[PDB]
Design a protein around this nucleic acid. Structure first.
Lengths: 176, 188
RNA sequence: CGGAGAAUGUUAUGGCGCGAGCGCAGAGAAAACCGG
């Protein structure tokens, strides 16, 4: 009948059409061909819908949350930022959708596993959390301004890549 | 007796009370004790009000937009970021208010003076725009998550629980240092 | 008090209730309608 699969697939399509500000559960119910009380069992309001959209965009496109076999910490942080940025760009206003959500327990566990990997490579526990925070804040900030100006030099990927590189070589220095 | 000075002063007080999501020109009109048609002459909608609020917090708190006498480019970028961050934190949801406003002509001129200062100090024109953009994106991202976090204070793994033992300023300062110490490398 | 988490509408120079004035409300509105 009507599973979480069609709910979120239709919700992500309507997010692209309308954006985060005009997206309503009523437009999703009409797009799905269901009454609003029926949809309330799968999504209870806009806040719950945005929470689900952000989680789904990460599971779909944030694939490089863990280091690969024999991958340097520099390459890991590099591809962790690119993966996170791809999720935010997977859909319209994806960074705005992500900013309004609260992290699940699985994301905290994933973050602890990242601190473990960084501390294993010579990072202090304090510096390992700062490196991950800085990369996240920079990536989120870059996409937020990029998607805000996407309503209208050009090309935000070079700015992101050169800034991510500035972070990585800065991390290398502060190790010594 | 309703001038632009009292409008934004009341508006920023109202921003702290209700936040960016609950801020409306009608609640501003009610706080000012005027009918909505009267307030329309000074601010035309929420978008115009947010544009004014973002500019006002910068003029008030973004004071270190220019290098001091004999101040290194490292110290300038450091204190330019700290000054910019102070503006975003000056009021509730200040980073969200800033995000979505379009730069005026004076900040383009102010920004040109910043590329000028950086290009003099050895930066390539290309690298000067990358350094300033990265510092801006990092500062904006840090305050956005920081201000989003202290709203969630209406309500975990131990190694993560060992790092939490407390605010966002230490993370901001160290991350800002990672950028600058990285900029030093990319010059050579 | 209930149909009802109704409709419509979004972020308000307007919409609405009472009657210049007082009052209501925002995507889990204010109105309007039906029922005891």
């Amino acid at each position: 009948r009507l599973d979480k699969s069609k709910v979120i697939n239709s919700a992500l399509e309507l997010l692209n059409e309308v954006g985060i500000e005009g997206l309503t559960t009523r437009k999703l119910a009409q797009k799905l061909g269901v009454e609003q009380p029926t949809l309330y069992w799968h999504v209870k309001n806009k806040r719950a819908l945005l929470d689900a959209l952000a989680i789904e965009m990460l599971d779909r496109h944030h694939t490089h949350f863990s280091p690969l076999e024999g991958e340097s910490w520099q390459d890991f942080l590099r591809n962790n930022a690119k993966s996170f940025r791809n999720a935010l760009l997977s859909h319209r206003d994806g960074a705005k959708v992500h900013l309004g959500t609260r992290p699940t327990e699985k994301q905290y566990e994933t973050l602890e596993n990242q601190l473990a990997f960084l501390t294993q490579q010579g990072f202090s526990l304090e510096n390992a959390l700062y490196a991950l925070s800085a990369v996240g804040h920079f990536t989120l900030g870059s996409v937020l301004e990029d998607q805000e100006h996407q309503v209208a030099h050009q090309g935000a990927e070079p700015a992101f890549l050169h800034g991510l590189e500035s972070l990585i070589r800065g991390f290398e220095v502060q190790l010594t």
